[PDB]
Amino acid sequence: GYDRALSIFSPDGHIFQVEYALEAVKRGTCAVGVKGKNCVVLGCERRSTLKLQDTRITPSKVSKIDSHVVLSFSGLNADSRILIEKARVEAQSHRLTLEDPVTVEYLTRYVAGVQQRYTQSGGVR
Amino acid sequence: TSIMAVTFKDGVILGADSRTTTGAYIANRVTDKLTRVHDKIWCCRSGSAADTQAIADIVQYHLELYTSQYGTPSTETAASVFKELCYENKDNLTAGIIVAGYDDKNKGEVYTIPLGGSVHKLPYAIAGSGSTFIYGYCDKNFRENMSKEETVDFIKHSLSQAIKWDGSSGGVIRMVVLTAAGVERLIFYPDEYEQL
Amino acid sequence: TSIMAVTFKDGVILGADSRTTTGAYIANRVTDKLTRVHDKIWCCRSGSAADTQAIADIVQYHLELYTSQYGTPSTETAASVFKELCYENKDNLTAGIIVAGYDDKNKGEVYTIPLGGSVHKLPYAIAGSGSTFIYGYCDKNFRENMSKEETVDFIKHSLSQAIKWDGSSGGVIRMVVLTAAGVERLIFYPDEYEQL
Amino acid sequence: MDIILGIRVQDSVILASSKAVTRGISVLKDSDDKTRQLSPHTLMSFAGEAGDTVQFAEYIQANIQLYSIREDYELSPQAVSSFVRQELAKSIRSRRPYQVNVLIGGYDKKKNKPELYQIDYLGTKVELPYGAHGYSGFYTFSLLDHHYRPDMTTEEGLDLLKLCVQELEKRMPMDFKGVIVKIVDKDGIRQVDDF
Amino acid sequence: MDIILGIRVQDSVILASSKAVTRGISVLKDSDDKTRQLSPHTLMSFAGEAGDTVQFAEYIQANIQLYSIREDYELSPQAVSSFVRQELAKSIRSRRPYQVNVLIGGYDKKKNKPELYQIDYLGTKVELPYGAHGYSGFYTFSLLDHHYRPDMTTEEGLDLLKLCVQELEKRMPMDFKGVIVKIVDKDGIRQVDDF
Amino acid sequence: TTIVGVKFNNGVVIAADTRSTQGPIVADKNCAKLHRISPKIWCAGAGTAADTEAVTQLIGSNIELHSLYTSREPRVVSALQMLKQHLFKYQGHIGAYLIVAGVDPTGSHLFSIHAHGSTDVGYYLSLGSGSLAAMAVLESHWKQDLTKEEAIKLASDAIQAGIWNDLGSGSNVDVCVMEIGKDAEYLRNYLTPNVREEKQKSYKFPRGTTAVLKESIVNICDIQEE
Amino acid sequence: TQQPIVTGTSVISMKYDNGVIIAADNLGSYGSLLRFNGVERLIPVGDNTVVGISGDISDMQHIERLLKDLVTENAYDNPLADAEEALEPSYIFEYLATVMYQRRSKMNPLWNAIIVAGVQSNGDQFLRYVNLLGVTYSSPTLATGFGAHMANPLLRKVVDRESDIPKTTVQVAEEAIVNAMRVLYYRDARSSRNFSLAIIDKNTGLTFKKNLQVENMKWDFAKDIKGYGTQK
Amino acid sequence: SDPSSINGGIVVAMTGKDCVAIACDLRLGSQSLGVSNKFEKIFHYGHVFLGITGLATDVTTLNEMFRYKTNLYKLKEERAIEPETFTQLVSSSLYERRFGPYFVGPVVAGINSKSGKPFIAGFDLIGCIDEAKDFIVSGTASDQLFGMCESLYEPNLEPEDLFETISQALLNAADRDALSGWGAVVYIIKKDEVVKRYLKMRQD
Amino acid sequence: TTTLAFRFQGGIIVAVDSRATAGNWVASQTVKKVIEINPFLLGTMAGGAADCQFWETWLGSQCRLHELREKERISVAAASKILSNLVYQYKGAGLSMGTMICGYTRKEGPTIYYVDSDGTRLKGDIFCVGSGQTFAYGVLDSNYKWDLSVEDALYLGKRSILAAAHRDAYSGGSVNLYHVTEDGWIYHGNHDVGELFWKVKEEEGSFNNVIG
Amino acid sequence: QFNPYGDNGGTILGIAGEDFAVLAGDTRNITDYSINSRYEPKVFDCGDNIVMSANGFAADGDALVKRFKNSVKWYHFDHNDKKLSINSAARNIQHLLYGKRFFPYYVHTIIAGLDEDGKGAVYSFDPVGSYEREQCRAGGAAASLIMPFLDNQVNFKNQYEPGTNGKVKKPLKYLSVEEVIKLVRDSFTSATERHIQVGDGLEILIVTKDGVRKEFYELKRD
Ligand SMILES: [Mg+2]
Ligand SMILES: [Mg+2]
Ligand SMILES: [Mg+2]
Ligand SMILES: [Mg+2]
Description:
The structure is cut from a larger assembly and holds 10 protein chains of 8 kinds.
Chain F: E1 3-8, E2 11-17, E3 20-22, E4 25-28, E5 34-38, E6 41-47, H1 49-70, H2 76-89, E7 96-104, E8 107-113, E9 119-121, E10 124-127, H3 131-141, H4 148-165, E11 173-179, E12 185-191, E13 212-218
Helix pairs in contact in F: 1-2, 3-4
Chain H: E1 10-16, E2 19-25, E3 28-30, E4 33-36, E5 42-45, E6 48-54, H1 56-77, H2 83-95, E7 104-111, E8 118-123, E9 129-130, E10 135-139, H3 142-152, H4 159-174, E11 184-190, E12 193-199
Antiparallel strand pairs in H: 1-2, 1-10, 2-11, 3-4, 5-6, 6-7, 7-8, 8-9, 11-12
Helix pairs in contact in H: 3-4
Chain I: E1 3-8, E2 11-16, E3 20-22, E4 25-28, E5 34-38, E6 41-44, H1 49-70, H2 76-89, E7 98-105, E8 109-116, E9 121-123, E10 126-129, H3 133-143, H4 150-167, E11 174-181, E12 184-192, H5 193-204
Antiparallel strand pairs in I: 1-2, 1-10, 2-11, 3-4, 5-6, 6-7, 7-8, 8-9, 11-12
Helix pairs in contact in I: 3-4, 4-5
The structure holds magnesium ion (MG) (4 copies).
One magnesium ion binds next to loops of chain H.
Active site (chain I): 1 (nucleophile)
Catalytic activity (chain I): Cleavage of peptide bonds with very broad specificity
Protein name (chain I): Proteasome subunit beta type-5
């Protein structure tokens, strides 16, 4: 199998592949989160360079991970689907084994863990 | 067990090894397997020791009572009594018996009674676990109307080979000679027959 | 089945009957049980026909590949390859094989490999269901350094008796002679060997 | 587990399941709920081998809930029953098969029709107006064959169900400690708390 | 059959026996009386293999009635129990043994004492303050070991018996369709028609 | 099933009956038991019918690829070696018992092969439940240097012995003749000695005899235009 | 219930225009060991009947003694014992069939298959079979054991139905029987070369042939057979 | 215990003049217990018809498997699969489970769309093909069907005459089998019209 | 097999199916499962066909001998006990019997005894025996009253066998009805289940699950 | 272990007409895959206008027929040469069979004749003696192939009158002896095609007030 170390340290102690991934995030449409006293609001930018779009069927920017937790993102759209699927599977797995839905912190910790893993595993970006 | 009986010019000779085993243990290394049911009618026993001793004792009784009433029984008659016990009780017996005897009218005769209780009159007969290994040798070397010395040699050589290959056979080679002259017992020790 | 191999002055001869049975039915009455694994290394097969054919084909392959790399294999080497297959696959095989071969350095050699996959180098060897009936005859009649004609007679007479008593053996007697002069096939029909 | 019954009436599906759990000599519990909600308008009752029943039911529940979140859509009762059948058909040729029989009661919101599916541990699926597993059908089907009408109300269905349970309580040797009854219709799933 | 219980109080012996008869799949009857009066002051309840139970009980009944007529005298409970034990001890080494367990409740008119004997199909006899056969004792003996007193009234015995039956109805898997209860005292044998 | 193979002057002939059974019931009355491994290598199968067909087609497929790879016409010894090594590996669990016959550049050949993987050579062979009936005929009439006509006659007579005497065999005789330097000639239903006699009565019903609840047209066509 | 110990193999037979023929080999097997080589398995009863027996030899010798006793018993107080009141093949068969069925009904069978061949008083051919189960049947040709599978097909080519019997001479019938015995020797592992053959004819009576041998055997073709596939 | 007779049921197929017929009962059961009277055992993929008897879970699984495979066939081949070709596909698919087989008795029926030739075929549970000219039978009353078909069948029957023959073969065979019945369906198949008829029969 | 018998105001109703099977093969659809012991006594066939036929015919002979000797009709109690005592002697040997002995006498009134090959003898009001017994019990239990008319009781017995015949694979063929009075039994015909099912479906409105 | 039973194959068929009765059977006898005989009679005239066949294990079959023929002989001796009626013969055979209840005759028995009103009669028995009067009964190897055909062609089962569509059944009109023989021959011809144990020959015994007549027909021998 393809084992090449793509994420490595540079002489100044930087991992450029991780830093270049942040540059992809910088390019993505803007997302914002604000929590009130009894709510949280997620706002997302839609670039109007694409009209003749069918808004009924086009992938929406905010995704339900469970009935009580949502996830929005900035960056590569295709990449986000992989994280969303993994998070949704883990949410159901947690309900199955702990008999309680995930806390927001736990779900965050899981997604963040997947992202870290892809920074020191061979053959992946 | 290795047993045989062979007719010859002057009569018949019975031969046997002396080994009795319980599994791989030799319970008796000097067994006498040549048993007398009448003066000049003897038998070689193979199979269950309990069964063949029981059968032989009953036959000896039958022939003793026959003799008191009708005089000396023929070898055919003795074989018939053996057969009757073996055939009718075939479900409950494990016995393979060779019957050998000397008449003056019929001379030397040999009858073999295998497991099922059938009877077969033969010039010579071999039986027991050791006999399997000497079917070839005996068929090639047996002649009719041999002398006493030739027949002793034939049996000595035959049972020597049976003992050599069969773990259930061994010890001394016992023989009983049946002729007009009488009844002679012979014994041959390992140091003799092993060098043949 | 009745099979044997016998070393003699000029080399070694393999012998076999030709009967293959499925129960009491003779599925083949003209079987060839003498199989070539190398030019002057042959074998006699007993046990499962499927197993011994499979083993022999694999050995023939191994010795063909050995020859291409290292030259002519010894009879000991051939026996070792047979043993390796029989020993390591003892749980899944029913095979009793006699290996016979002629070298110029070692001359005639015979190795027997029984059910367990052990090896035994012998002056001669007998195997198969029919062999039980000729242990006595073969032990009494085998001599070392016999002539070709004497060895042919010894095998012919031995297998004749095995065929006579064993229902699983019969048909023609096949033989293969291995000497410096080459490889000779012999066949003997019932009308010949039954009158011996 | 023991008795599981189902009946599809005009506008709903009713599932009745026994409350007893017996481990050999003793009745360990008399309030056990042998059912799992797979989606808002789909309910599954189950019976079979101990352990495997709850393990299979919760596994199916987790999978349907996952589909619901991924697509933001509730699968039809027919689609759920087909998914369940395949899982059991797969299981029957496994190293250790799920020994679990199920009834699936669902209300199809698209067709506005109640639907009842009966599936055994082999993966044998049939759609029925009424069904059961084990010996339950042997006692109840003659009553259902007589009284059942396709235009029955929910109340009439419950009354016919009571007659079935009464016949079970009379002729069955085992004490199954009554039944929990649940109704599946256009408004979802609810439990009848007095039966 | 299934459950048979017995309790010996101050002045009487009380026998309780289940009413169900089950032939495999179906409960064929729910009013079966698993007892025979052997003499005016001696009652025997029974349970075991089908057919053999009633055959054995009626055989014993016939024999005790024969003795009563021949001698114009009622045998003591002890004497009847010894006769029954011998018949079962004889039976256990027969070609086909009687597979029958019994309780014998009698009032001894000579000693003015109630007596309860427990005998199994092997011919194992014991005199007890309270007894049972099968699994009945496993559920009831802890209650009897706690509450039993030798000076209890008949009414107190019936109340302790009700507690035993309630525990059986709770923890036993089989529906035995209640019990028929009979009292044996100085005045003879009577059935409690509301239990 | 009865199957035979017979060597003759300039080739080999194989024959078989045409009855296949499930227990005591005759599933098919005109079954084809002669199978083609390659144009001039044919075989007949007894035992588990699916196994005999499957193992024939698998080795036949691989034989065809081997022939194309080597630019040579397939050999009978290759079919034999591939069949036996496949069967041995499955330790008799593939219940194929075959008689394999054919011609190739090396000459004419006749072999038998058993389910556990053992093979045999012969001038005349028989297999199947009717093999003892067939072998009785072969042992009575076989001789060295048979002609083509004599071998076809002997083979079909041996199958007839199975047909009439074995309950497992029946109906017709199929024959295939493989001669050196010629096309193999497959003779399907070479003999037809078991035609059913005319029935005493016609069992054609009057129209409207069967009670019908519902009628409907079944749409076998695809979704239509417009 | 028992098991056969010493056993005899096939008995074969057929009808021809003027009578019947029956044959059986002279071997007594002990499993795969070919133990006894001089066993007569065809037993004549008078001058009109031959009884051929396969299976357990101890039981055969018992049946032989029963038949011997039957002849003795029939002669008792019977002035026409060698004429009108002689034993018929049909009488001998029915007696044996009765014994065989009775023994199986006590779960203690005589482990045999038996063919009774003979000619009746009126000249009619008699040929009928009975076995350890008491099963009986008649046919223009009859055979036991391996003979049923290999001999019958050959013998049925000569006499296929009843109407073929008058067209079949004694020379053609004996030829067919002798050939069948050769085929059995080729193919039965519990057979021997030596056999007996009996002819019962309505004109020439009972002809009993002992010490016959299988001859004209084909073995020469074996010399060309080499290996089991690829060996040259 | 025997997987091929847990659920019960039968299928029969016949050829006529320029036509074929295939028929089945409607019962599904759990041994003695009748469970469904609407369990149809005949399916079709284009103009090719497949009847399946045996273990009901495998009947459903194989229908789904052959729908799967014939759909992919059509997308790649750009034409509907023919009866002869589909027969080989069924045989191949069954043999691939040689040592863990589907407990079924499939039956194929159809007319080749190019030659117009009527075609039928049968299989054992592991794939052996029976290609009869006259008729094919399958299921728990296969003995009864063999008896009916052997006496009732004659070659070259017109479509409406073939309907009567196959209907009477099914009905009377099913009435002598405990595990078959509870309704019946008959398909009459011509080159470009197929008629489906539900029969009235006893319900015990 | 499905057989039933029940006591009511007007006597006893006996109803049976007609099917016999050997495995899956339907051997007969015309089996007589009510044994006419004598003009006053009926017995039902379940388990072993021969065991029931033979020993209940034999029972008729014993009943006839009893009334010749005692000059009085045998009681149902005594008749049933003669059979149960007989089969008890054979216990272990492999008899197979499950039967209802039915009669109506002066001293007893309408009486039914369930007699069985392991020796069981049970008096009762309603009994059902056979592979389809559970289906018939359902219809019986929910519709049974003591004060049923002869007409309604006959129909209830017919309807209960039909229920079993429909669902139980090994029950069917036809329904045989009997009404047992004090003056003897009266036969109420043979009813083909095929024809009966459609007739009952239409007139009653039952079996809506089945298309007709 | 010794097995006291065997299977000799064979198929038999009894049909009762209005004033006649036929009992037919194939003449082939077999064990396993071998043919013992192509002509071994299986249907027997037992006297008193009664014909009988006991199909299955032939040793038990021959024993039973032999014991019944004997029972007819002793019935004449004991009851002043009174004719044994078909119903009386049937009850007698039950007792012969049930006498070996715990070691049964491994056969399926059928008898045929005329009842005391001159009408055709057929009785059928199981191995241990259960019996019934029947109109139509096949027995033995190919019974499952023959009975459904007879249900359809003798009793007109599943046949309705054209035009009514299931409302009116086909009326059960009486069949002649020629008509019944046609159905018997077609039954055995079809059974011969599909069952390996059926073939060689067909022997039919016909019973009328005039007595017992025989007819023989060839069947395929493969
Ligand atoms: Mg030999
Ligand atoms: Mg049916
Ligand atoms: Mg039914
Ligand atoms: Mg046939």
